[PDB]
Design a protein around this ligand. Structure first.
Ligand SMILES: CC(=O)N[C@@H]1[C@@H](O[C@H]2O[C@H](CO)[C@H](O[C@H]3O[C@H](CO[C@@H]4O[C@@H](C)[C@H](O)[C@@H](O)[C@H]4O)[C@@H](O)[C@H](O)[C@H]3O)[C@H](O[C@@H]3O[C@H](CO)[C@@H](O)[C@H](O)[C@H]3NC(C)=O)[C@H]2O)[C@H](O)[C@@H](CO)O[C@H]1O
Ligand SMILES: CC(=O)N[C@@H]1[C@@H](O[C@H]2O[C@H](CO)[C@H](O[C@H]3O[C@H](CO[C@@H]4O[C@@H](C)[C@H](O)[C@@H](O)[C@H]4O)[C@@H](O)[C@H](O)[C@H]3O)[C@H](O[C@@H]3O[C@H](CO)[C@@H](O)[C@H](O)[C@H]3NC(C)=O)[C@H]2O)[C@H](O)[C@@H](CO)O[C@H]1O
Ligand SMILES: CC(=O)N[C@@H]1[C@@H](O[C@H]2O[C@H](CO)[C@H](O[C@H]3O[C@H](CO[C@@H]4O[C@@H](C)[C@H](O)[C@@H](O)[C@H]4O)[C@@H](O)[C@H](O)[C@H]3O)[C@H](O[C@@H]3O[C@H](CO)[C@@H](O)[C@H](O)[C@H]3NC(C)=O)[C@H]2O)[C@H](O)[C@@H](CO)O[C@H]1O
Ligand code: NA
Ligand code: NA
Ligand code: NA
Ligand code: NA
Ligand code: NA
Ligand code: NA
Lengths: 600, 600, 600
C-alpha cells in the first residue's frame, strides 16, 4: 500500500490525509489540510466538467450551472459565503430552471448563502433583446406561493455587467437582484453597470420581507434605449429596509425621461446619503393598495435624507391609491437635508421639474390619495432660470397635508398645478415663512403667479410668502382662481421687495373675505379727506375693502401741511377710513401703499 | 525513514512538510502548506478534546473553553481574527473564570483579537434564570483595577441568541458585549436576539474608552418578562463613540414600559440613522456625576440624528446630576432629522409620551440638573388623537436652556409639566415661530392648555405660538399659573385660527405686566365712545389693560355712520383708548377683537 | 521516482501534487491544494530573500520591495486583495522607483489591487526630516502624463504609523495615500497616526477621478512641529467622492493653528457624520481655477452634514478664484446638522473663530470670488464667552449669496468683517428670523456691533435680528458704516429684549432712507402736543424721521388725562406726527419707545 499512499496523496482525498495543527500548537485540533480548505469555498470548487476538471471562465463559457451548483451545495450545509474570484469575468449564458423560471431568473439565491463578488459577472448575448432577472430569491413562479429568502448577502468589490443589451420589447422586465420575500438580505459594495433594465435591485414582495438594505453600491448606465418602458434602480417593497450611501449615474437621454433612483413602497423605509446624476426622478414614496398584503395598507416612517441630486424631472414623488377592497395611505414622511438641482435643459424638454410632486395614481386619478403628515425641511433646490417648468411643489392630486419649513427653493414656481387639468382638494398645506425663495428666476415670470393655487379648494392651509429680492415680472405672488374655494387659511405676503408690484395677492373670487380667512398683503389705495382743519378723516375712493380689519401705511408723507392716517379701519360700504391731521384745512387727495390686514 | 516520510505526512506536522509557492511564481516565498493555513484561524482549531480530536458543536456541547483557548492563543501572537464558522450553532454552557467572573462573564475578549461571527452563538439552559455577560473586555472583577481592551472588533453575518430565558430576579444584570475600558472596539453586522437582558452592548466604563461603535447591527426581542427591571440596548459610556445604522425591535408588552434603544453618557457621542420599533424610549442623553471619572464631568457634543422610531414613551430624555463631590453637566446637544411616532396605545397606558423629556435624576430630584445649549430642529413627531399623555416636551426638572426650531409636532401638548408635581426652574427655553403645531388632537383638548407652563419660574424664554388649524376645545394656547414667575421673556400668540377662542394667552398672576415681558395675543374688548361728531375717542369698559402698549383691530366694522379706532393705547386706569370717527354723532358701543401688544 | 515523489512533495511544487475536492463532494472540482491556497495572497508570499527563504519583518528590515513585488504580481493577474498580516509591524525604509519617484513615493498602487491592512505599517527613520508619500497611485512623475488608478481599495483594522518624524523643511510634502487620477478607490477602517504630514489621504487630481471615498477611518496626531506649513487630513480633488463616518484628532498646539480635517475641491462631494477634535478648521469648500482641468470650473453639490467638531478657527471656509484663463465658481452648497464648538482658548490666540468663513484667495484677493446658492441650516455653534474673535460668519471676500435658516449661533458676533481690511461686495446674504442668537456673550460686547456690516456694499440681503435675551453691553444690534452702500434690502430688529438699548440698528450714512430699503427697529422719541382739548396731534421734537413710513408705541401711557397716539406717520420736515387724545387740554411732552417702520 505505499503505492496506495502515493496514490491516496495524488487523489482528490489526498489533502484529507495530510495532517495539520494550527501554528504547531499542541493544544490545537489535529486536523487534515482538507478540513482547513473546507472552511472556505469558491466558484472554482464547482466550475468543472463532468470528470471534475476545472473549466476556465470566458465569453464562450456559460458559468450559470456551476454557480448554481455551488449555491445549492452550500445551502445544503446550512449556509456560508461563496467567493466569485477576482481577476476573472464569469459569464452567464442561459436561464435557470424551476421556481425562478417564472421570473426569467438566471441564478436562484438561497437562504444563508452569501455571495462575495470580487470578480465580474457578465451577461452573454444569449440575453440580448430578452427579459432576465439575474439573481432571484423567490423559489416559486407565483410569488404568493413562494417561500422566503433569509440571511442572504451579496457584497464585494466586484461588478455585475448587463452586457449593454437593449430591451427587445417595452413589456419585458429586467432586474439584477430580486431578493423576493426577503428577510435580512443585503447588497453592499457592488457596481451594477452597462444595461437597459427595469430595476437593478428589488427588496421584498408586496410588503413581505424585513431588514433589507442596499449600501455603498454603484449603479452606472442602466438605461440605454427608447424601448425601455421605465426604470427605477432600487424598488423597496418590504418594511424596515432602505438604501444608503449609494451612487447612481445615467448618461442616456432616455434616462432623463424615465429613470428614478429609488422607490420606497412600504413603512419604515429610507433613502439617505446618496448621490444621483442623469436621472428623471429621485425617489417615489408611494403606498400602493395593490402592494399591501404583507405589511399593511399604510406607508409611514418614510425618510428621504441627506441626498445629493442632479435630475431632470421630480425629486420626491408622493402617492397613495386604492383597489376595490384595499385603501392605501401615506403619512409620517420626512424629506430633509437634500441638495437637488434640475440639470441644464430646455424648458418642457423633460417631465415637469419639481422638488416635491403630489402625483396622481398610475391610471391618472387624482381623487384617491390619502397623503398627510409630511415634513419637508432644510432642503435646497435649484433650477436654471430658463426652466419654466420648475416648482418647489407640483400639487397635482388630492393632498391631506404637507409641511414646508426652512427650505431654500430657487426655481420658477413655489406652488404650482396646471390650470384646466386636475383640481385637487387641498388640506393642511403649510408653507412657513422660513422658506427662502431664491432669485434665479427673477425677470422671467411674465404672466405667471409665483404660488399658482390651481385647486378645487384649500382648507387649513398656511402660505407665508417672503421674497428675498425683487421680481417685478411676475403677475402676482399668489393667486387663487375663482374656482378655488379658500377657508380656514392664512395667506400673507411680506412687504419686502413688493413696493412696485401692482398685484401681490390675488383672490379672483374675493375669497379673502371668508369668515375664517386670515390674510395680509400690500396694496395701493387712493384716499381723499374732508376739508376740516385739525383731526380729519381720510376715506378710500374705492369700495372693495369691506373684508379689511386694519391697514397701515407703507409710504412716506411728502407733505408738510397735513398727514394721512397711519392706520385705517373699514366701513360697511367697503371704504377704508382713518383719522389724519390737517395742519391747515383743505380737501386732500393721496395715493398710499398700505398693508391690508384681515384678522391678523 | 521513507516510513517516517509517510508517517511525517499523516502526522499533525505533515502540512509543514508539503512545499508551496504562490501561483508557481519563482519570485515568491518557498513556503510550506502549514504556513499558508496558519494565516487564518477558526474555532475549529481549538474545538477539540484532550487528544486533539475535533468535537462537533451542538446543544449538549459547551463551546466556551474552546473559544476562550482560541482567543487566548491568538492574543499571545499579537492578535488576529478568529472565525466562528457559518453553518453551525456554537453553544455556551458555563461561566468563564478569572477577571470576568466578577461580571458574570462567559467569554473574555482580548486586545487585537477580533471575532468574525458567521455562525450562531447560543446560550444553553445553564443560564436560565441567571445573570450573564456574554463577552467581557474587563480583565479584573473591579473595573477600576481593570486593564484596557483595545482594537477588538466583533463582526459578521452571524447571530448571538440569548436562548429566550427570563431573568430570575430583577436585581440581576445581563449583557451581550461589555467591551470594558475599551479603545477602538466595535460591533458590526451582528444580530442579537431572543432574550431578556439589561443591555445588548455596552461601550466604555465611566468615561474610560474611546472610538467605540455599533454599526449595522440588529437587536430583536431582548425583553420578555415582568422580572426585567430595565433595558437599554446600547449604553455608550466612553467618548468619541456611537451607534449608527442599526435596527431595534421589541414585541413584548414589557418592552413598551421599560426598554430604551440607546444611552449616550459621555461627550462626543452619537446615535444616527437607526430604526426603532416597540420600545418605550429612544435615547437617554445624560451626564451622570457617578460616571465622570474617565472623561470629565461634562457631556457635550451629543448628536441624535436622522432616526426613525415608533415608541410608547419618550424619544430623547435629557439629564444631569451630582454626587457629593462631582457635578455633571449636559450641554451642546443636537436632536435633528428624526421622524418619531407614539405607537397605537390607550392614554396613560405607558410612560408619558414625549419627543423631549427633561427628566429628574434617578432619585427623582429635579433641582440638580445643568442642561443647556440644546438644539432640537427639523424633527417630526406624531401621536394619535386619543393619547392625552403626549407632548413635544415634558419639562419636569430644572432646565438651563433648550432651543426648538423648525420642527413639526403633532400631539396633545406642546410644552407640558404636571401641576402639583415638580416646579422646575426654567431658563432659555426657546420655541421659535417656525415650529409647526399639527391638528391631530384638535377637538380633544377640553380643559387643557396647549402650552401648560407648570413651572416655578420662566426667564429668558421665548414662546411663539402659531396654530395651523382651529382647536376651539382647548382652554388656552398658553397658560401661566400664578405660582410661575415670568420675566425677561417673549410670549406671542399669532392670531390665525384664534378668532373664536375665548382665551388665547392666560396669565393667572398678571405676569404679562412685568417690566421685561414682551407679549402679544388676541382678546375681545368692549368699547364705548363719547357722543361727539367727528374724531371721537373710544374707551374700553374694562380696566385690565394697564400693561398694554398698543392694540389694533382684528375685526371688521359693520357700521356706515362711524368707525372705531384702528389702533389703541392705554391710560393709567387700565382702560384702552383710541381715536375713531363719528360721521354722525352719538355714543357708540362695540365689541371688537384686538391684538393686544406689550412692548412688541 | 518514489524518491522523486517524496522530493516533489517537499519541493515548492508539492502542494500542486496533493489532491483536494471540496468537502468530499463528488460533484466538485478535482483540484490540488496549491489551487486553493492560490485563491488568497499575503505579503508573506513575497517577503523573502533571493533564495526564497521568508524574512521576518521588523525595524531593521525594509519591507518596501516585497510589498511592491506583491502588488506588481497581483496586478499582472487582473487584480485581487493582498493581506498585510495581523500581529506584525511591517517597516518601510526606502523610496520607490519609477513614476512614483517624482512624488517622493514609497509604494505604487495598481489598479484592481486591494490592500487588506490588518497589521501595522510603520515608517523607518530613513524618512526622518524627509518628504514622502506612502502609497501613490500616479504612474508618472508628471500627474498630467499619468495613467489612472482604478478599483483600488485599502481597508482593514490595521494602522499606518508615520513614525513621529518631524518635517525637515516647510516646503516639503508628506502624504499617506495619494490615489492619483483615481476612479472607484477607497480607504475604509484604517488608523493613520503619529506623524507630521501635509495630508493623510488625497483623492483625485485636478478634477480627474470619480467615486473615491474615505469611510470609518481614524486620523490621530498627524501634526507635531512648527516646521509643518499646513495640514489637511483628506483633500478631495475629484467629483462624486467624499468622507463619511471618520474620526479626526490632534493634540499639538500647532494643529490648532494649521490643521483642517477635510477639503472639498470638486463638485458632488461630501463630508458627513464625522467627529473632529483639536483642529484649526473643519472643512474648506473651494473651487480653485487651478484645479479645474478634469471636472470643470464649478464646485456644485457640496455637502457638509451631521459632523461633530471642536476646533480653534473656522468650521467651513468657502472660496473660489481665478487664473488668467479659467474662472472658478462655487454654488449649490449645503451645511446642515453640524454641532460645532470653538475649544477653550484665549481670545485672538488662534485664527478668528467662525462657523462660516468667506475667505479670500491664497494670495489674499477678495474680489475674485463667485460664491452663491449656499444653504446653512439646522446647525449649532458655540464659542466660550471670552472668545472675542468668534462669529457665525466672517464675511471677508466678495459674496454672491449665502442663506442662513434655523441655526443656533452662540458666539460674539453674528456677521463680522474687520473694519479697515477688505471691503467685500455682498449680494443675497439672507439671515432668516429663525436663527437663534444665544446668550453666552451677553455683557461682553462693549464697543461692539452684533452684526458688524463692514462691507463695501450690501444688496438683495435680509437681516432679521431676533434676540433671545438681553445684552445691554453691545453698542448696537446691527451697524452699517457710512462707507457701506445698502439697497434693495430688508433689515429688522425685533423689539424683544431691546427696550433698554440706546441703539438697536445704526445706519451711519442714513442708508435706511434708500428707496428700496425695508427696515424696522425700535427707537426712543420725544414728542410734544398741541394744547387742544380732544383729538390732538403729537409731533416729534427731532426731525430725523423723513424715511419713516409708520411707527407705533412700544410704551405704556402712565397718564389719565391724555394719551399719545398709538401710531404715527411722518411729515416732510422729518417729524413724526400722530393723533392722540387730550381728555383735558394742555401742551403735553412725552418720551416714548416706538417701533420705527419703513415700507414694512
Ligand atoms: C419600473 C417601476 O418601478 N415603475 C414604478 C411603478 O411600478 C409599477 O410598474 C412597474 C413597471 O415595471 C412594475 O410592474 C411590472 O412588474 C410587475 C411585477 O412583476 C411580476 O411580479 C414579479 C414579482 C415577478 O418577478 C415578475 O416575473 C412578474 O411576474 C408586473 O405585475 C406588472 O405587470 C409589470 O408592469 C411594478 O410592479 C411591482 O414591482 C415590484 C418590484 O419588482 C414588485 O415587488 C411588486 O410586487 C410589483 N407590484 C405589483 C402591484 O405588481 C408596478 O408597481 C410604480 O407603480 C410607480 C409609482 O411608485 O412608479 C413607477 O416608477
Ligand atoms: C438599564 C439601564 O441602562 N438603565 C439606565 C440607568 O442606568 C443605571 O441603572 C442601570 C440598571 O441596570 C445600571 O446599574 C446597574 O449596573 C451597575 C453597573 O454594574 C456593575 O459594574 C459593571 C461594570 C460590572 O460589569 C457589573 O458586574 C456590575 O459590577 C451597578 O453598579 C448598579 O448597581 C446596577 O443597578 C447602570 O450602571 C451603569 O452601567 C453601565 C453599563 O454597564 C456601566 O458602564 C456604568 O459603569 C454603570 N454606572 C454606574 C454609576 O455604576 C446605571 O447607570 C440610567 O442611570 C438612567 C439615566 O440615563 O437610564 C436608565 O435607562
Ligand atoms: C495643505 C493643504 O491642503 N492646503 C490647502 C491649500 O492647498 C494648496 O496648498 C497646498 C500646500 O501643501 C498644496 O500645494 C502643495 O502641493 C502642490 C501639489 O503637489 C504637487 O503635485 C502632486 C500631485 C505631486 O504628488 C507632488 O509631488 C507635487 O508635485 C504643489 O504644486 C504646491 O507647490 C505645493 O505648495 C495644494 O496643492 C494641491 O494638492 C492636492 C492634493 O495633493 C492636489 O490634488 C492638487 O493637484 C494640488 N493643486 C494644485 C493647484 O497644484 C494647494 O492647492 C488650499 O489651496 C487652501 C484653500 O482650499 O486651503 C489650504 O488648507
Ligand atoms: Na413572473
Ligand atoms: Na372648487
Ligand atoms: Na460586578
Ligand atoms: Na414660583
Ligand atoms: Na512631484
Ligand atoms: Na462702499
Amino acid at each position: 500500500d505505499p503505492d496506495q499512499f502515493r496514490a491516496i496523496i495524488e487523489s482528490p482525498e489526498g489533502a484529507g490525509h495530510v495532517g495539520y495543527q494550527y501554528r504547531r500548537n499542541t493544544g490545537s485540533t489535529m486536523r487534515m489540510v482538507s478540513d482547513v480548505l473546507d472552511e472556505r469555498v469558491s466558484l472554482w470548487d464547482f466550475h468543472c466538467d463532468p470528470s471534475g476538471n476545472v473549466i476556465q471562465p470566458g465569453p464562450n463559457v456559460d458559468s450559470r450551472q456551476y454557480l448554481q451548483a455551488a449555491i445549492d451545495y452550500v445551502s445544503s450545509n446550512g449556509g456560508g459565503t461563496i467567493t466569485i474570484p477576482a481577476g476573472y469575468t464569469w459569464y452567464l449564458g442561459s436561464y435557470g430552471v424551476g421556481g425562478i423560471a417564472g421570473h426569467s431568473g438566471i441564478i436562484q439565491l438561497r437562504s444563508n448563502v452569501n455571495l462575495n463578488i470580487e470578480g465580474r459577472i457578465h451577461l452573454s448575448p444569449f440575453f440580448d433583446l430578452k427579459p432576465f432577472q439575474v439573481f432571484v430569491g423567490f423559489d416559486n413562479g407565483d410569488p404568493a406561493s413562494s417561500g422566503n429568502l433569509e440571511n442572504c448577502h451579496i457584497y464585494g468589490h466586484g461588478v455585475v455587467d448587463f452586457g449593454g443589451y437593449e430591451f427587445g420589447a417595452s413589456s419585458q422586465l429586467r432586474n439584477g437582484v430580486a431578493f423576493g420575500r426577503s428577510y435580512n438580505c443585503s447588497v453592499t459594495g457592488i457596481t451594477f453597470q452597462n444595461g437597459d433594465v427595469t430595476w437593478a435591485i428589488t427588496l421584498g414582495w408586496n410588503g413581505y420581507g424585513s431588514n433589507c438594505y442596499v449600501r455603498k453600491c454603484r449603479f452606472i448606465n442602466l438605461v440605454n434605449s427608447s424601448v425601455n418602458a421605465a426604470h427605477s434602480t432600487v424598488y423597496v417593497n418590504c418594511p424596515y429596509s432602505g438604501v444608503e450611501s449609494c451612487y447612481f449615474s445615467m448618461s442616456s437621454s432616455f434616462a432623463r425621461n424615465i429613470a428614478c433612483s429609488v422607490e420606497l413602497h412600504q413603512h419604515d423605509t429610507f433613502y439617505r446619503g446618496s448621490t444621483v446624476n442623469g436621472y428623471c426622478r429621485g425617489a417615489y414614496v408611494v403606498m400602493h393598495a395593490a402592494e399591501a398584503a404583507g405589511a399593511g395598507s399604510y406607508a409611514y416612517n418614510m425618510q428621504v435624507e441627506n441626498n445629493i441630486a442632479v435630475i431632470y424631472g421630480q425629486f420626491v414623488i408622493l402617492g397613495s391609491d386604492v383597489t376595490a377592497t384595499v385603501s392605501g395611505h401615506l403619512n409620517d414622511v420626512i424629506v430633509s437635508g437634500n441638495i437637488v438641482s434640475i440639470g441644464e435643459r430646455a424648458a418642457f424638454s423633460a417631465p415637469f421639474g419639481a422638488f416635491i410632486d403630489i402625483g396622481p395614481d398610475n391610471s391618472g386619478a387624482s381623487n384617491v390619495q390619502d397623503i398627510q403628515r409630511v415634513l419637508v425641511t432644510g432642503n435646497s433646490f435649484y433650477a436654471p432660470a430658463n426652466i419654466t417648468d420648475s416648482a418647489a411643489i407640483t400639487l397635482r392630486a388630492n393632498l391631506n397635508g404637507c409641511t414646508f419649513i426652512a427650505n431654500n427653493f430657487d426655481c420658477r414656481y413655489m406652488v404650482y398645478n396646471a390650470p384646466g387639468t386636475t383640481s385637487p382638494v387641498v388640506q393642511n398645506l403649510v408653507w412657513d415663512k422660513s422658506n427662502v425663495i431664491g432669485g434665479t428666476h427673477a425677470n422671467q415670470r411674465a404672466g405667471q403667479n409665483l404660488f399658482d393655487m390651481q385647486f378645487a379648494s384649500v382648507v387649513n392651509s398656511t402660505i407665508e410668502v417672503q421674497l428675498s429680492c425683487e421680481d417685478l415680472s411676475m403677475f402676482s405672488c399668489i393667486l387663487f382662481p375663482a374656482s378655488c374655494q379658500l377657508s380656514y387659511s392664512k395667506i400673507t405676503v411680506d412687504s419686502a421687495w413688493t413696493k412696485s408690484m401692482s398685484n401681490t395677492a390675488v383672490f379672483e373670487g374675493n375669497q379673502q373675505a371668508g369668515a375664517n380667512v386670515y390674510v395680509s398683503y400690500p396694496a395701493t389705495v387712493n384716499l381723499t379727506s374732508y376739508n376740516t382743519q385739525g383731526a380729519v378723516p381720510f376715506f378710500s375712493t374705492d369700495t372693495n375693502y369691506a373684508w379689511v380689519t386694519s391697514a397701515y401705511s407703507l409710504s412716506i408723507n411728502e407733505n408738510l401741511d397735513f398727514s394721512p392716517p397711519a392706520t385705517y379701519t373699514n366701513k360697511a360700504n367697503g371704504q377704508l377710513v382713518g383719522v389724519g391731521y390737517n395742519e391747515i384745512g383743505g380737501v386732500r387727495s393721496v395715493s398710499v401703499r398700505l398693508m391690508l390686514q384681515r384678522q391678523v
